[PDB]
mmCIF file of C-alpha atoms in Angstrom:
data_model
loop_
_atom_site.group_PDB
_atom_site.id
_atom_site.type_symbol
_atom_site.label_atom_id
_atom_site.label_comp_id
_atom_site.label_asym_id
_atom_site.label_seq_id
_atom_site.Cartn_x
_atom_site.Cartn_y
_atom_site.Cartn_z
ATOM 1 C CA UNK A 1 19.886 -0.848 -4.035
ATOM 2 C CA UNK A 2 20.111 -3.540 -1.246
ATOM 3 C CA UNK A 3 18.440 -1.896 2.568
ATOM 4 C CA UNK A 4 21.219 -2.186 5.354
ATOM 5 C CA UNK A 5 18.468 -3.313 7.590
ATOM 6 C CA UNK A 6 16.468 -5.485 7.653
ATOM 7 C CA UNK A 7 12.856 -4.948 6.339
ATOM 8 C CA UNK A 8 10.429 -5.529 9.218
ATOM 9 C CA UNK A 9 13.239 -3.475 11.381
ATOM 10 C CA UNK A 10 11.171 -0.850 9.940
ATOM 11 C CA UNK A 11 7.880 -1.915 10.582
ATOM 12 C CA UNK A 12 7.225 0.382 13.183
ATOM 13 C CA UNK A 13 8.716 3.990 12.407
ATOM 14 C CA UNK A 14 7.558 3.365 8.667
ATOM 15 C CA UNK A 15 0.902 6.097 10.687
ATOM 16 C CA UNK A 16 -1.542 5.497 13.657
ATOM 17 C CA UNK A 17 -3.832 7.831 13.262
ATOM 18 C CA UNK A 18 -4.720 5.211 11.150
ATOM 19 C CA UNK A 19 -5.840 2.913 14.260
ATOM 20 C CA UNK A 20 -9.686 1.735 14.667
ATOM 21 C CA UNK A 21 -10.574 3.191 17.720
ATOM 22 C CA UNK A 22 -14.087 1.216 18.880
ATOM 23 C CA UNK A 23 -17.192 3.955 19.038
ATOM 24 C CA UNK A 24 -16.224 4.059 23.089
ATOM 25 C CA UNK A 25 -12.967 4.479 23.362
ATOM 26 C CA UNK A 26 -13.068 7.663 20.173
ATOM 27 C CA UNK A 27 -12.412 10.385 22.967
ATOM 28 C CA UNK A 28 -9.160 8.039 23.026
ATOM 29 C CA UNK A 29 -7.271 8.698 20.037
ATOM 30 C CA UNK A 30 -4.865 11.609 20.286
ATOM 31 C CA UNK A 31 -3.529 10.157 16.478
ATOM 32 C CA UNK A 32 -6.197 12.235 15.232
ATOM 33 C CA UNK A 33 -7.743 14.279 16.753
ATOM 34 C CA UNK A 34 -3.942 16.477 16.052
ATOM 35 C CA UNK A 35 -4.604 16.060 12.343
ATOM 36 C CA UNK A 36 -4.632 18.430 9.638
ATOM 37 C CA UNK A 37 -2.038 19.645 11.305
ATOM 38 C CA UNK A 38 -0.594 17.028 12.437
ATOM 39 C CA UNK A 39 2.216 15.387 15.157
ATOM 40 C CA UNK A 40 5.365 14.699 15.483
ATOM 41 C CA UNK A 41 6.499 11.541 16.478
ATOM 42 C CA UNK A 42 9.901 10.773 18.171
ATOM 43 C CA UNK A 43 11.762 6.907 19.541
ATOM 44 C CA UNK A 44 14.402 5.814 19.986
ATOM 45 C CA UNK A 45 14.225 1.535 20.051
ATOM 46 C CA UNK A 46 17.418 -0.585 22.119
ATOM 47 C CA UNK A 47 18.065 -3.259 20.091
ATOM 48 C CA UNK A 48 18.783 -5.641 22.923
ATOM 49 C CA UNK A 49 22.343 -6.876 22.289
ATOM 50 C CA UNK A 50 23.118 -4.791 19.507
ATOM 51 C CA UNK A 51 22.402 -0.593 18.962
ATOM 52 C CA UNK A 52 19.546 1.896 18.474
ATOM 53 C CA UNK A 53 17.698 3.291 16.832
ATOM 54 C CA UNK A 54 16.713 6.880 17.119
ATOM 55 C CA UNK A 55 13.886 8.324 14.830
ATOM 56 C CA UNK A 56 11.927 11.957 14.658
ATOM 57 C CA UNK A 57 8.739 12.359 12.660
ATOM 58 C CA UNK A 58 6.868 14.415 11.475
ATOM 59 C CA UNK A 59 2.780 13.477 10.070
ATOM 60 C CA UNK A 60 0.712 15.720 9.305
ATOM 61 C CA UNK A 61 -1.938 15.413 5.430
ATOM 62 C CA UNK A 62 -1.057 17.391 2.313
ATOM 63 C CA UNK A 63 -3.633 17.987 0.746
ATOM 64 C CA UNK A 64 -5.460 14.640 0.245
ATOM 65 C CA UNK A 65 -2.778 12.021 1.390
ATOM 66 C CA UNK A 66 -1.833 11.022 5.133
ATOM 67 C CA UNK A 67 2.244 11.728 4.787
ATOM 68 C CA UNK A 68 5.120 10.601 7.862
ATOM 69 C CA UNK A 69 7.967 11.884 7.077
ATOM 70 C CA UNK A 70 11.247 10.199 9.469
ATOM 71 C CA UNK A 71 14.730 10.600 9.360
ATOM 72 C CA UNK A 72 16.044 7.998 10.894
ATOM 73 C CA UNK A 73 20.151 7.407 12.836
ATOM 74 C CA UNK A 74 21.148 3.914 14.027
ATOM 75 C CA UNK A 75 24.249 3.344 16.661
ATOM 76 C CA UNK A 76 25.437 1.623 18.491
ATOM 77 C CA UNK A 77 25.056 -1.460 15.843
ATOM 78 C CA UNK A 78 26.852 -4.959 15.855
ATOM 79 C CA UNK A 79 28.282 -5.551 11.596
ATOM 80 C CA UNK A 80 28.021 -8.881 12.352
ATOM 81 C CA UNK A 81 24.441 -8.931 15.025
ATOM 82 C CA UNK A 82 21.018 -9.887 14.022
ATOM 83 C CA UNK A 83 21.032 -6.312 12.640
ATOM 84 C CA UNK A 84 23.573 -5.890 9.604
ATOM 85 C CA UNK A 85 24.011 -9.175 9.477
ATOM 86 C CA UNK A 86 20.554 -9.831 8.381
ATOM 87 C CA UNK A 87 19.440 -12.755 10.348
ATOM 88 C CA UNK A 88 15.633 -12.132 10.598
ATOM 89 C CA UNK A 89 12.865 -13.848 9.565
ATOM 90 C CA UNK A 90 10.761 -11.936 7.012
ATOM 91 C CA UNK A 91 7.340 -11.917 9.364
ATOM 92 C CA UNK A 92 5.932 -9.726 12.209
ATOM 93 C CA UNK A 93 4.718 -10.148 15.610
ATOM 94 C CA UNK A 94 1.932 -8.980 17.156
ATOM 95 C CA UNK A 95 1.643 -5.680 19.452
ATOM 96 C CA UNK A 96 0.142 -4.258 22.224
ATOM 97 C CA UNK A 97 1.564 -0.839 22.355
ATOM 98 C CA UNK A 98 0.578 0.558 25.328
ATOM 99 C CA UNK A 99 -0.147 4.728 25.358
ATOM 100 C CA UNK A 100 -0.449 6.517 28.101
ATOM 101 C CA UNK A 101 -1.064 10.877 28.518
ATOM 102 C CA UNK A 102 1.485 13.309 28.567
ATOM 103 C CA UNK A 103 -0.424 16.469 29.698
ATOM 104 C CA UNK A 104 2.891 18.627 29.967
ATOM 105 C CA UNK A 105 3.676 17.988 26.408
ATOM 106 C CA UNK A 106 -0.255 18.080 25.198
ATOM 107 C CA UNK A 107 0.312 14.671 23.933
ATOM 108 C CA UNK A 108 1.306 11.282 24.821
ATOM 109 C CA UNK A 109 3.970 8.325 24.837
ATOM 110 C CA UNK A 110 4.010 5.211 24.391
ATOM 111 C CA UNK A 111 5.999 1.673 25.489
ATOM 112 C CA UNK A 112 5.938 -1.440 23.601
ATOM 113 C CA UNK A 113 9.213 -4.326 23.384
ATOM 114 C CA UNK A 114 8.535 -6.016 19.461
ATOM 115 C CA UNK A 115 10.077 -9.344 18.935
ATOM 116 C CA UNK A 116 11.874 -10.156 15.534
ATOM 117 C CA UNK A 117 12.176 -13.513 14.351
ATOM 118 C CA UNK A 118 15.544 -15.101 13.993
ATOM 119 C CA UNK A 119 16.473 -16.998 11.498
ATOM 120 C CA UNK A 120 18.035 -19.393 14.033
ATOM 121 C CA UNK A 121 15.012 -19.362 15.973
ATOM 122 C CA UNK A 122 16.051 -16.731 19.002
ATOM 123 C CA UNK A 123 14.675 -13.930 19.324
ATOM 124 C CA UNK A 124 15.439 -9.993 18.682
ATOM 125 C CA UNK A 125 13.786 -7.485 21.275
ATOM 126 C CA UNK A 126 13.232 -4.170 19.411
ATOM 127 C CA UNK A 127 12.424 -2.228 22.862
ATOM 128 C CA UNK A 128 10.648 0.995 21.790
ATOM 129 C CA UNK A 129 10.059 4.460 23.849
ATOM 130 C CA UNK A 130 8.154 6.635 21.978
ATOM 131 C CA UNK A 131 6.462 10.662 22.209
ATOM 132 C CA UNK A 132 3.966 12.691 19.967
ATOM 133 C CA UNK A 133 3.442 16.591 20.070
ATOM 134 C CA UNK A 134 0.880 17.804 18.629
ATOM 135 C CA UNK A 135 1.925 20.811 15.678
ATOM 136 C CA UNK A 136 -1.146 22.869 15.927
ATOM 137 C CA UNK A 137 -2.124 25.079 18.399
ATOM 138 C CA UNK A 138 -5.807 23.671 19.229
ATOM 139 C CA UNK A 139 -7.092 21.889 21.690
ATOM 140 C CA UNK A 140 -5.898 17.614 21.021
ATOM 141 C CA UNK A 141 -7.752 14.463 22.946
ATOM 142 C CA UNK A 142 -5.337 13.463 25.080
ATOM 143 C CA UNK A 143 -6.836 9.634 26.782
ATOM 144 C CA UNK A 144 -6.490 7.169 29.517
ATOM 145 C CA UNK A 145 -4.331 4.484 29.471
ATOM 146 C CA UNK A 146 -4.929 1.885 26.476
ATOM 147 C CA UNK A 147 -3.040 -0.073 24.234
ATOM 148 C CA UNK A 148 -3.122 -0.670 20.514
ATOM 149 C CA UNK A 149 -2.845 -4.208 19.539
ATOM 150 C CA UNK A 150 -1.327 -5.140 15.983
ATOM 151 C CA UNK A 151 -1.158 -7.512 13.003
ATOM 152 C CA UNK A 152 0.583 -7.425 10.317
ATOM 153 C CA UNK A 153 1.422 -9.516 6.917
ATOM 154 C CA UNK A 154 5.406 -8.692 4.691
ATOM 155 C CA UNK A 155 5.101 -9.950 1.605
ATOM 156 C CA UNK A 156 6.949 -8.798 -2.149
ATOM 157 C CA UNK A 157 5.571 -7.521 -5.404
ATOM 158 C CA UNK A 158 6.436 -10.798 -7.502
ATOM 159 C CA UNK A 159 6.685 -8.183 -10.091
ATOM 160 C CA UNK A 160 9.176 -5.686 -8.639
ATOM 161 C CA UNK A 161 12.598 -5.714 -9.596
ATOM 162 C CA UNK A 162 14.194 -3.561 -6.451
ATOM 163 C CA UNK A 163 14.645 -4.061 -2.967
ATOM 164 C CA UNK A 164 10.909 -3.289 -1.314
ATOM 165 C CA UNK A 165 7.892 -4.642 1.111
ATOM 166 C CA UNK A 166 4.564 -4.617 0.907
ATOM 167 C CA UNK A 167 2.735 -4.764 4.024
ATOM 168 C CA UNK A 168 -0.159 -5.190 5.000
ATOM 169 C CA UNK A 169 -1.370 -3.795 8.695
ATOM 170 C CA UNK A 170 -5.031 -4.655 10.893
ATOM 171 C CA UNK A 171 -4.214 -2.593 14.369
ATOM 172 C CA UNK A 172 -6.656 -1.407 16.599
ATOM 173 C CA UNK A 173 -7.912 0.560 20.359
ATOM 174 C CA UNK A 174 -8.567 -1.539 23.638
ATOM 175 C CA UNK A 175 -8.144 -1.288 27.385
ATOM 176 C CA UNK A 176 -10.716 0.791 28.102
ATOM 177 C CA UNK A 177 -20.695 10.723 16.659
ATOM 178 C CA UNK A 178 -16.940 11.895 15.997
ATOM 179 C CA UNK A 179 -15.179 12.422 18.738
ATOM 180 C CA UNK A 180 -12.917 14.754 16.867
ATOM 181 C CA UNK A 181 -13.138 16.933 14.443
ATOM 182 C CA UNK A 182 -9.562 15.266 12.877
ATOM 183 C CA UNK A 183 -10.931 11.886 13.460
ATOM 184 C CA UNK A 184 -13.674 12.950 10.140
ATOM 185 C CA UNK A 185 -11.136 12.953 7.983
ATOM 186 C CA UNK A 186 -10.567 9.125 8.070
ATOM 187 C CA UNK A 187 -14.411 8.234 6.957
ATOM 188 C CA UNK A 188 -12.975 6.488 3.915
ATOM 189 C CA UNK A 189 -9.665 5.695 2.356
ATOM 190 C CA UNK A 190 -6.549 8.073 2.747
ATOM 191 C CA UNK A 191 -4.418 8.307 0.663
ATOM 192 C CA UNK A 192 -0.632 7.304 2.427
ATOM 193 C CA UNK A 193 3.086 9.421 1.789
ATOM 194 C CA UNK A 194 6.002 7.600 3.685
ATOM 195 C CA UNK A 195 9.183 9.213 3.272
ATOM 196 C CA UNK A 196 12.345 8.425 5.286
ATOM 197 C CA UNK A 197 16.075 8.883 5.926
ATOM 198 C CA UNK A 198 18.491 6.846 7.549
ATOM 199 C CA UNK A 199 21.615 5.971 7.969
ATOM 200 C CA UNK A 200 22.815 2.946 10.076
ATOM 201 C CA UNK A 201 26.620 2.862 11.213
ATOM 202 C CA UNK A 202 27.203 5.286 8.198
ATOM 203 C CA UNK A 203 25.030 3.098 5.785
ATOM 204 C CA UNK A 204 22.637 5.632 4.637
ATOM 205 C CA UNK A 205 19.509 4.522 2.833
ATOM 206 C CA UNK A 206 16.277 5.476 1.977
ATOM 207 C CA UNK A 207 12.438 4.945 2.074
ATOM 208 C CA UNK A 208 8.733 5.360 -0.545
ATOM 209 C CA UNK A 209 6.464 4.468 0.748
ATOM 210 C CA UNK A 210 2.650 4.418 -0.726
ATOM 211 C CA UNK A 211 -0.723 2.964 -0.645
ATOM 212 C CA UNK A 212 -4.127 3.909 1.645
ATOM 213 C CA UNK A 213 -5.447 3.503 5.384
ATOM 214 C CA UNK A 214 -8.540 2.883 6.235
ATOM 215 C CA UNK A 215 -8.903 4.223 9.664
ATOM 216 C CA UNK A 216 -13.411 2.927 10.274
ATOM 217 C CA UNK A 217 -11.525 -0.365 9.532
ATOM 218 C CA UNK A 218 -8.236 -0.123 10.854
ATOM 219 C CA UNK A 219 -5.908 -1.161 8.350
ATOM 220 C CA UNK A 220 -3.432 -0.372 6.336
ATOM 221 C CA UNK A 221 -2.139 -1.426 2.858
ATOM 222 C CA UNK A 222 1.388 -0.075 1.792
ATOM 223 C CA UNK A 223 4.904 -1.034 -0.265
ATOM 224 C CA UNK A 224 7.984 -0.204 -0.102
ATOM 225 C CA UNK A 225 10.636 1.012 -2.339
ATOM 226 C CA UNK A 226 14.802 0.980 -1.468
ATOM 227 C CA UNK A 227 15.325 4.784 -2.970
#
């Protein structure tokens, strides 16, 4: 069935281990270094003048597949706002995701504000607070401050009757041999599974996505369906 929220508002929730870290920055790639056991990724996404999402995800390898399983809880949305009112354009602007180390948790934090394009020409801000904690006990790479620069295209499968989103994304790190064992799990093309269970103002929904990532070029290609 039709999602109760616009697909662009779920993009950031729906695997930063596929970012391209240039050779001179590979010692700053926390995400891959946490693999295969993975990390817990938590966010609060505050839609300005509207509600918020709170998310928790486990990102880890299961066999040959990188899996991202998320629970999302949305609260305090306006039923006639840009989100529940479906007033956002079907596209996605570039972001710079600013990353800093969180030595106490042996992980990272990240901050950025997404600008969703509204159909009337206005903008809907989605302010992101993020924290990632490794699940395993082994050493991880704790980075110097840097950012991830993103590029995204959203499209449709002309033969898909279900509500869905086709996504192509390129992400490269910027602003600063393998540097970790986990890095080497991403050398080729890696299959991806995404599962999201959501509840926004009591509207329940789920999303399943499948595709592949190529961290050497920072590329994600995925198709998501409402389930």
